Amino acid sequence: GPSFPEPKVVRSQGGLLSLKLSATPTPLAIAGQRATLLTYGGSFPGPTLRVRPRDTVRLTLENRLPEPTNLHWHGLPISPKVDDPFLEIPPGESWTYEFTVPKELAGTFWYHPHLHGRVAPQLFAGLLGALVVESSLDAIPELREAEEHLLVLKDLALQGGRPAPHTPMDWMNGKEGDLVLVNGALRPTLVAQKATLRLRLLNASNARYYRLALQDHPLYLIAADGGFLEEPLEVSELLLAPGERAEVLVRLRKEGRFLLQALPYDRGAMGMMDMGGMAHAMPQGPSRPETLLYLIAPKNPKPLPLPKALSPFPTLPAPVVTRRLVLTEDMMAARFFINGQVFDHRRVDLKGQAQTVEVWEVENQGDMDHPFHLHVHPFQVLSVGGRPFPYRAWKDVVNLKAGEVARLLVPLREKGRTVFHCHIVEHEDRGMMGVLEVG
Ligand SMILES: [Cu+2]
Ligand SMILES: [Cu+2]
């Protein structure tokens, strides 16, 4: 093991993972001063949980914060009476989450808070961690002998030894920070010992986007948010919006040292300037480039061949209803809407039936990018902007630029009441969420 850090791992044993985890304030040392964050298990990021299909999970959460909280199990297809967005745990009390892992699941998932009105300050302060589901496909020679790592992407900012407070502009644009970190560290070094790598990737930031590229190399895509592709797909760069995940293979062919970067991207945020003229002044424009890590290749590298096939994607029944959902903005007031209204936890917006399939059309009539998320029921993307999607795999977040319409196929699984919302989490707290009931 070189000198590259990753979070501590907890694994199942005899078919069961049973753990007591506390949410607490903690002092750390990360930039140049004393810093007290809010953490799970005393670390930033929290610990990684690792399981297999048909295992039982029993997680007891102990609240030692000065305000109430709960958990969302992002991407898991389980009952909404377990993954419950309306529950509240008071200061000083505990609650146990119990479920079984579904039979055909594989990939990278995560856990974080979801108490409406307080999501954005609690996630910015440090509360998140990863969950990994192993597969029988991981045994084939082209994956078994690769060098494997997890990369958690998240940014931060400090004031007076605490996380910086939210400002009026933050509720409008969403909050970014100046310290851009990997696995809790500023620009770490990875000294590789093999020529083929398998990297699992997670965007756990409040609002920042990452346009990823490795100097002098392409990337080979093998999984999306919620499962494997049908075969590997070669790309030259890869955009990841807040809440999305992916897995890739890298093939090193020459000695050297190579930068992994987040390249310039314009997500439509609005700026602060005063009367000084240019030729493009009012929006913020594209981001500045950032260096994520340094990657050093081994001596005389010889990479492995690619796998020929992965997992076939299932066929689904024909649909019986169509929905249309339109997103809009009021920027100076920082208020955000779905079909002309804001969230109300006592109102039901859609009613569907278990064991049927629906077509959902989601349209962006604003000027900013917005990334759309649905709880409990994963989906297949068919097209964006009237043009075809490039692969077949399970997803749970889809990005939309200004003007774009996405078409989705949605099979309805577990019964009960759940939600859908934007994952720029400041926009969720300020109105952009609604309610679905399945009977
Ligand atoms: Cu989430
Ligand atoms: Cu939004």
Side-chain angles (χ1 to χ4, degrees), residues 4-9 48 148-151 183:
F4 184 75
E6 288 168 82
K8 171 196 168 185
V9 179
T48 299
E148 184 183 353
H149 295 287
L150 171 74
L151 308 178
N183 292 346

PDB file of all heavy atoms in Angstrom, residues 4-9 48 148-151 183:
ATOM      1  N   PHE A   4      -1.505   6.589  -0.392  1.00  0.00           N
ATOM      2  CA  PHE A   4      -2.733   7.259  -0.809  1.00  0.00           C
ATOM      3  C   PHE A   4      -3.839   6.963   0.194  1.00  0.00           C
ATOM      4  O   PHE A   4      -4.159   5.786   0.414  1.00  0.00           O
ATOM      5  CB  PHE A   4      -3.153   6.805  -2.208  1.00  0.00           C
ATOM      6  CG  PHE A   4      -4.371   7.521  -2.743  1.00  0.00           C
ATOM      7  CD1 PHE A   4      -4.285   8.832  -3.200  1.00  0.00           C
ATOM      8  CD2 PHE A   4      -5.594   6.881  -2.799  1.00  0.00           C
ATOM      9  CE1 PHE A   4      -5.407   9.495  -3.691  1.00  0.00           C
ATOM     10  CE2 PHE A   4      -6.730   7.534  -3.283  1.00  0.00           C
ATOM     11  CZ  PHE A   4      -6.634   8.853  -3.733  1.00  0.00           C
ATOM     12  N   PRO A   5      -4.452   7.978   0.805  1.00  0.00           N
ATOM     13  CA  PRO A   5      -5.479   7.733   1.830  1.00  0.00           C
ATOM     14  C   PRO A   5      -6.874   7.474   1.256  1.00  0.00           C
ATOM     15  O   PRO A   5      -7.276   8.082   0.257  1.00  0.00           O
ATOM     16  CB  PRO A   5      -5.463   9.033   2.644  1.00  0.00           C
ATOM     17  CG  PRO A   5      -5.078  10.096   1.614  1.00  0.00           C
ATOM     18  CD  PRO A   5      -4.096   9.409   0.691  1.00  0.00           C
ATOM     19  N   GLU A   6      -7.615   6.577   1.924  1.00  0.00           N
ATOM     20  CA  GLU A   6      -9.031   6.260   1.702  1.00  0.00           C
ATOM     21  C   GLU A   6      -9.736   6.055   3.040  1.00  0.00           C
ATOM     22  O   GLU A   6      -9.096   5.660   4.024  1.00  0.00           O
ATOM     23  CB  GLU A   6      -9.209   4.983   0.850  1.00  0.00           C
ATOM     24  CG  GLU A   6      -8.850   5.135  -0.625  1.00  0.00           C
ATOM     25  CD  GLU A   6      -8.765   3.802  -1.369  1.00  0.00           C
ATOM     26  OE1 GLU A   6      -9.819   3.272  -1.791  1.00  0.00           O
ATOM     27  OE2 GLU A   6      -7.636   3.288  -1.530  1.00  0.00           O
ATOM     28  N   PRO A   7     -11.054   6.301   3.109  1.00  0.00           N
ATOM     29  CA  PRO A   7     -11.782   6.108   4.381  1.00  0.00           C
ATOM     30  C   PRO A   7     -11.757   4.665   4.900  1.00  0.00           C
ATOM     31  O   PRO A   7     -11.726   3.700   4.129  1.00  0.00           O
ATOM     32  CB  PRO A   7     -13.220   6.544   4.037  1.00  0.00           C
ATOM     33  CG  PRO A   7     -13.063   7.506   2.877  1.00  0.00           C
ATOM     34  CD  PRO A   7     -11.871   7.003   2.093  1.00  0.00           C
ATOM     35  N   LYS A   8     -11.777   4.531   6.238  1.00  0.00           N
ATOM     36  CA  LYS A   8     -11.882   3.220   6.895  1.00  0.00           C
ATOM     37  C   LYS A   8     -13.138   2.458   6.442  1.00  0.00           C
ATOM     38  O   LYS A   8     -14.201   3.054   6.256  1.00  0.00           O
ATOM     39  CB  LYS A   8     -11.895   3.423   8.421  1.00  0.00           C
ATOM     40  CG  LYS A   8     -12.205   2.186   9.255  1.00  0.00           C
ATOM     41  CD  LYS A   8     -12.589   2.572  10.686  1.00  0.00           C
ATOM     42  CE  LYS A   8     -13.175   1.387  11.452  1.00  0.00           C
ATOM     43  NZ  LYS A   8     -13.670   1.776  12.810  1.00  0.00           N
ATOM     44  N   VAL A   9     -13.013   1.119   6.277  1.00  0.00           N
ATOM     45  CA  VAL A   9     -14.069   0.245   5.731  1.00  0.00           C
ATOM     46  C   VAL A   9     -14.634  -0.692   6.807  1.00  0.00           C
ATOM     47  O   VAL A   9     -13.881  -1.279   7.597  1.00  0.00           O
ATOM     48  CB  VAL A   9     -13.543  -0.588   4.537  1.00  0.00           C
ATOM     49  CG1 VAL A   9     -14.630  -1.532   3.959  1.00  0.00           C
ATOM     50  CG2 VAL A   9     -12.976   0.301   3.452  1.00  0.00           C
ATOM     51  N   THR A  48     -16.878   3.920   5.047  1.00  0.00           N
ATOM     52  CA  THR A  48     -17.466   3.205   3.904  1.00  0.00           C
ATOM     53  C   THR A  48     -18.061   1.866   4.365  1.00  0.00           C
ATOM     54  O   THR A  48     -17.372   1.072   5.011  1.00  0.00           O
ATOM     55  CB  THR A  48     -16.417   2.945   2.807  1.00  0.00           C
ATOM     56  OG1 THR A  48     -15.888   4.182   2.287  1.00  0.00           O
ATOM     57  CG2 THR A  48     -17.015   2.127   1.637  1.00  0.00           C
ATOM     58  N   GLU A 148      -7.670  -1.119  -7.443  1.00  0.00           N
ATOM     59  CA  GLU A 148      -8.962  -0.478  -7.146  1.00  0.00           C
ATOM     60  C   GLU A 148      -8.832   0.649  -6.106  1.00  0.00           C
ATOM     61  O   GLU A 148      -8.156   0.477  -5.085  1.00  0.00           O
ATOM     62  CB  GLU A 148      -9.959  -1.547  -6.641  1.00  0.00           C
ATOM     63  CG  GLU A 148     -11.404  -1.075  -6.357  1.00  0.00           C
ATOM     64  CD  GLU A 148     -12.330  -2.179  -5.779  1.00  0.00           C
ATOM     65  OE1 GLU A 148     -11.923  -3.364  -5.700  1.00  0.00           O
ATOM     66  OE2 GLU A 148     -13.473  -1.852  -5.393  1.00  0.00           O
ATOM     67  N   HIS A 149      -9.512   1.793  -6.352  1.00  0.00           N
ATOM     68  CA  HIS A 149      -9.586   2.923  -5.407  1.00  0.00           C
ATOM     69  C   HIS A 149     -10.959   3.621  -5.463  1.00  0.00           C
ATOM     70  O   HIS A 149     -11.597   3.671  -6.520  1.00  0.00           O
ATOM     71  CB  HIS A 149      -8.481   3.972  -5.684  1.00  0.00           C
ATOM     72  CG  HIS A 149      -7.079   3.470  -5.463  1.00  0.00           C
ATOM     73  ND1 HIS A 149      -6.551   3.250  -4.208  1.00  0.00           N
ATOM     74  CD2 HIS A 149      -6.095   3.153  -6.343  1.00  0.00           C
ATOM     75  CE1 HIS A 149      -5.311   2.800  -4.322  1.00  0.00           C
ATOM     76  NE2 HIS A 149      -5.012   2.727  -5.609  1.00  0.00           N
ATOM     77  N   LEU A 150     -11.402   4.175  -4.311  1.00  0.00           N
ATOM     78  CA  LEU A 150     -12.561   5.081  -4.215  1.00  0.00           C
ATOM     79  C   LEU A 150     -12.107   6.545  -4.117  1.00  0.00           C
ATOM     80  O   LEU A 150     -11.170   6.857  -3.360  1.00  0.00           O
ATOM     81  CB  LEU A 150     -13.428   4.735  -2.986  1.00  0.00           C
ATOM     82  CG  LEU A 150     -14.579   5.675  -2.553  1.00  0.00           C
ATOM     83  CD1 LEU A 150     -15.799   5.565  -3.499  1.00  0.00           C
ATOM     84  CD2 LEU A 150     -15.014   5.446  -1.087  1.00  0.00           C
ATOM     85  N   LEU A 151     -12.788   7.447  -4.870  1.00  0.00           N
ATOM     86  CA  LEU A 151     -12.498   8.893  -4.912  1.00  0.00           C
ATOM     87  C   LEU A 151     -13.755   9.716  -4.580  1.00  0.00           C
ATOM     88  O   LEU A 151     -14.648   9.871  -5.432  1.00  0.00           O
ATOM     89  CB  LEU A 151     -11.948   9.317  -6.291  1.00  0.00           C
ATOM     90  CG  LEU A 151     -10.758   8.594  -6.932  1.00  0.00           C
ATOM     91  CD1 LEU A 151     -10.407   9.155  -8.337  1.00  0.00           C
ATOM     92  CD2 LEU A 151      -9.549   8.645  -6.015  1.00  0.00           C
ATOM     93  N   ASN A 183     -11.126  12.835  -0.843  1.00  0.00           N
ATOM     94  CA  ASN A 183     -11.066  12.003   0.371  1.00  0.00           C
ATOM     95  C   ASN A 183     -10.617  12.811   1.594  1.00  0.00           C
ATOM     96  O   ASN A 183      -9.930  12.290   2.484  1.00  0.00           O
ATOM     97  CB  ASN A 183     -10.169  10.762   0.173  1.00  0.00           C
ATOM     98  CG  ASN A 183     -10.762   9.741  -0.819  1.00  0.00           C
ATOM     99  OD1 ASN A 183     -11.942   9.815  -1.164  1.00  0.00           O
ATOM    100  ND2 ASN A 183      -9.945   8.774  -1.254  1.00  0.00           N
TER     101      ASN A 183
END
